[model samples]
Target: SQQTRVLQEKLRKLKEAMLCMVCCEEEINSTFCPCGHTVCCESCAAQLQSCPVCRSRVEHVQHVYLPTHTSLLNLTV
Candidate 1:
C-alpha cells in the first residue's frame, strides 16, 4: 500500500506538469486553430499542421502563457 501511494503521488505530479503533446517535455504554450486544442509548445506549433488531440486544420495559433499574477486561467491542454 505504501508503494502504491508513492506511485499515485508521482502520477499526480506528472499530470500537474502540463507537458506538451508535441515535445512531451516543456509545458504547453499554444493552442492551434479554431478547435482551440492546447497541446503544443511554441517550437513544435510551427512544425505541425493539425491539432494533436483533434484532426482539425490549423489556420491560426494563440499563445496560452499566463503570468502567475494574472487572473486568467492557463489553457487546458
Candidate 2:
C-alpha cells in the first residue's frame, strides 16, 4: 500500500509538473492544433495566429486546445 500511495503521489506530482513548451507562461492544458503543437493555457492558444516558436501561420483552420485550460491547480504542485 505504501508503494501504491507513493506511486499515486508521484503521479500527482508528475501531472502537476507537466508543462508546455509553446506557451511557457503557464502549465500545459492540452495540445493545440493546426500544427498539433502543444501549449499551456487558453489565452495563449487563442492569441496564436501563428506558431510563436516557428512563426507558422494557422489562419482559416480548425484549431482546438480548450480541454487543456489551466485551473492553476498547482501553483507549486
Candidate 3:
C-alpha cells in the first residue's frame, strides 16, 4: 500500500516546499529545535536523551513548529 502511495507521489512534486524531509510531516506537529536546526518531529526530537538535529541534550531544545502549518496539514492527510 505504501509502495503505491510512493509511486503516486513520485509522479508529482511535493506539496510543501519546506516540508520535514525526515518524517515527511507537512503538519504543524512537526518541529525543530533552537539554532535553526530542523527535526523530524517532536517525538523524534524528544525520544531518548539525544536531539534529532544536533544529537545534543534536549535541554536547549524548543519546539519551533509553526501554527500556520496546521492549515496546510490537510495536504498530506
Candidate 4:
C-alpha cells in the first residue's frame, strides 16, 4: 500500500506536467491574462496580448515555481 501511494504521487506530477495548455508540449510555468489562465510559456506570452482560451485581454502574468515541480521549468507537456 505504501508503495502504491508513492506511485500515485509520481503519476500526479507527471499528469500535471502533461497538461500544459500552451504549445501543448511543455509544462505550465507561467500564467497570463486577467483571467489567470495557465497555458503559455514565457516565450509565447511575449508574443500575445490576450488569452487564447477565452480571448480575454492580458493584464498580468504570474510565474509559478513549485519546489516539487522544479523540473517543470525545463520540460514540456
Candidate 5:
C-alpha cells in the first residue's frame, strides 16, 4: 500500500503543477513554437493566434506525445 500511495501522490502533483497556463484548467498537452514555451490543452490553445504568455509568433501550435511521466494504457480494452 505504501507504493500505491506514493504513485497516487505523484500523479496528483503532476496534475496540479502541469495545468495549462492559458486556461488555468485541464492538462498541458499543446506546445507553442520558437519561444519553446509550452502551455495549452487543445481547445483553448486553438483560439490562440499568438503566444499569449511570451508574445512570440505563433508560427506553429504543435501538439505531441508528452506522456513521459503520466502513463495512460488501455491494455486490450
Candidate 6:
C-alpha cells in the first residue's frame, strides 16, 4: 500500500492548489489577464471586474487547463 499512499498524498497536496480561491467550492480554471493569476473558477472569473490578486483592471481572461487524462488506450482518435 506504499504506492497507494504516494498517489493519495500527491493528490491531496495537489487538491489544495486546484481549489478556487474566490469561491472555494470549484476548481480554478481561469486566469486574470494583466495580473495573470489563475486563482478562481470560470463563473467567478467572469464575475470579476478587476484582478483578484493584483487589483488591476481586467481587460480579458485567458482560459486555463491543467491536463490529466492518460488512463486510456494508446489508440489514436
lDDT of 6 at 68: 42
Candidate 2: where are CA atoms >4 Å away? 1-17, 20-25, 60-77
Write candidate 2's Cα lDDT for 1-77 as tens digits.
89999999998776665565554556665444556555445566676688655666755333345554456574775
Q: What residue runs in model 1 are displaced by over 4 Å at the alpha carbon?
A: 1-4, 7-17, 67-77
Per-residue error (Å), model 6, residue 36: 0.8
For residues 28-65, could you state the per-residue lDDT of candidate 3 as single tens digits? Answer: 24344344465445555555365555666545446664
Query: Which candidate would rank higher by TM-score, 3 or 4?
Result: 4
Is candidate 3 or 5 superior in TM-score?
Answer: 5
> lDDT of all predictions, in order shown?
0.76, 0.60, 0.53, 0.73, 0.77, 0.83
Q: How well is each residue in 7-72 modelled by candidate 4, as lDDT tens digits? A: 999998777665566566555667885697777766677677888888998897888775545454
> Distance (Å) between predicted and true CA of 16, model 4?
6.7
| Candidate 6 lDDT over residue span 1-77, tens digit each | 89999999999888877888889878788889878888988899999999888899989988876784122474689
Using lDDT as the yardstick, the better of models 1 and 5 is 5
For each of the candidates, give the backbone clash count.
0, 1, 0, 5, 0, 0
Off by over 4 Å in 6: 1-11, 68-77
Error of 4 at 69 (Å): 2.0
Give the alpha carbon lDDT tens digit for every residue of 1-77 in model 5: 99999999999886777887767767778788878677777777788888878888777778857755353563466
Descending-TM-score candidate ranking = 6, 1, 5, 4, 2, 3
TM-score for model 4? 0.56
RMSD from true fold, candidate 3: 6.8
lDDT for model 2, on a 0 to 1 scale?
0.60
Give per-residue CA lDDT, model 1, range 6-66, as digits (tens). Answer: 9999997766566677677667778897999877778998788887788888998898864
TM-score of 5: 0.62
